[PDB]
Every structure is written in structure tokens, then in C-alpha cells.
From Swiss-Prot:
Changing Y99A: No effect on integrin- and heparin-binding, loss of FGFR1-binding, defective in inducing FGF1 signaling, cell proliferation and cell migration. This is Fibroblast growth factor 1. Keywords: Acetylation, Angiogenesis, Cytoplasm, Developmental protein, Differentiation, Growth factor, Heparin-binding, Mitogen, Nucleus, Phosphoprotein, Secreted. The lineage of its organism: Eukaryota, Metazoa, Chordata, Craniata, Vertebrata. Changing N100A: No effect on integrin-binding. No effect on integrin- and heparin-binding, loss of FGFR1-binding, defective in inducing FGF1 signaling, cell proliferation and cell migration. It comes from Homo sapiens (Human). It is found in: Secreted; Cytoplasm; Cytoplasm, Cell cortex; Cytoplasm, Cytosol. The keyword Zinc does not apply.
Length: 142
């Protein structure tokens, strides 16, 4: 269990999704160059993701458009990976009996999450923590 709770979201990985950030109302986005951020633009073409489960509670967040994997580096920087690797795995959990959160598996011991600031910019691993709005996500149908 990676020393973390085990409350899981009720959803499934049948179809792709949009990852809506409660904090600023931004959709998670991966640009072709590998840049990760958030945009309020629903018509954007790089905001669609396909999640897959590696193991119960561990997922991959792959961009349907570019095929890039959401990933978090050794210094807590979120980036788009060409290939799937250990830095691409996230522990997908329920939060506040409602939202989804993604903790970097590799850095789970430090509670490094995926998160978006109100300004649409992505957060560095160490800057995130339980209790922030930046970490709460809502997966929406595309």
C-alpha cells in the first residue's frame, strides 16, 4: 500500500477524460514539447487523457493526442515522457470523499502530488500537500 490510505475513486478507465482542477478551474494539459500546465480552454486538443491501471490504485496518465505520459522528475518537476517509466506511475486516490488525487509513486514517501496553481501553472512536488485545493481533481468525460 505504499504506506498510504486506500480509498479509491469509483470511476473506471473505459474512456478518456479531462482532468479538471478544482483550484483554478483548469484542465490538465501536456503540450507536444513536453510542457505541462493547465488551461481553461475546453476546446484545447491536448487536454484529453487515457488512464490505465498498472496495479490496483496505480495509474498511467497518457495523453491521447501526443501519446506522452504524465511524469514527475527527481526534483519534483512534472513533465511529459515519451516512454512509460517509473516516474510515470501515480497512486490514484479518493480525496474528501469526492475528488481524485495523484501522488507520485516514486516519491510517495514525501507526499509529492500532481497539482495546478490558480494561475494554471503546475506545482513542484515539494510545494504540494494534503489540504490544498491545487491537488484536487475531477475527471470529466471528453
Amino acid at each position: 500500500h505504499h504506506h498510504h490510505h486506500f480509498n479509491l475513486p469509483p470511476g473506471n478507465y473505459k474512456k478518456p477524460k479531462l482532468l479538471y482542477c478544482s483550484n483554478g478551474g483548469h484542465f490538465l494539459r501536456i503540450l507536444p514539447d513536453g510542457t505541462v500546465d493547465g488551461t481553461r480552454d475546453r476546446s484545447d486538443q491536448h487536454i484529453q487523457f487515457q488512464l490505465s491501471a498498472e496495479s490496483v490504485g496505480e495509474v498511467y496518465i497518457k495523453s491521447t493526442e501526443t501519446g506522452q505520459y504524465l511524469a514527475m522528475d527527481t526534483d519534483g518537476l512534472v513533465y511529459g515522457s515519451q516512454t512509460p517509466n517509473e516516474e510515470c506511475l501515480f497512486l490514484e486516490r479518493l480525496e474528501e470523499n469526492h475528488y481524485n488525487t495523484y501522488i507520485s509513486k516514486k516519491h510517495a514517501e514525501k507526499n509529492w502530488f500532481l497539482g495546478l496553481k490558480k494561475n494554471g501553472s503546475v506545482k513542484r512536488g515539494p510545494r504540494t500537500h494534503y489540504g490544498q485545493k491545487a491537488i484536487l481533481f475531477l475527471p470529466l468525460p471528453v
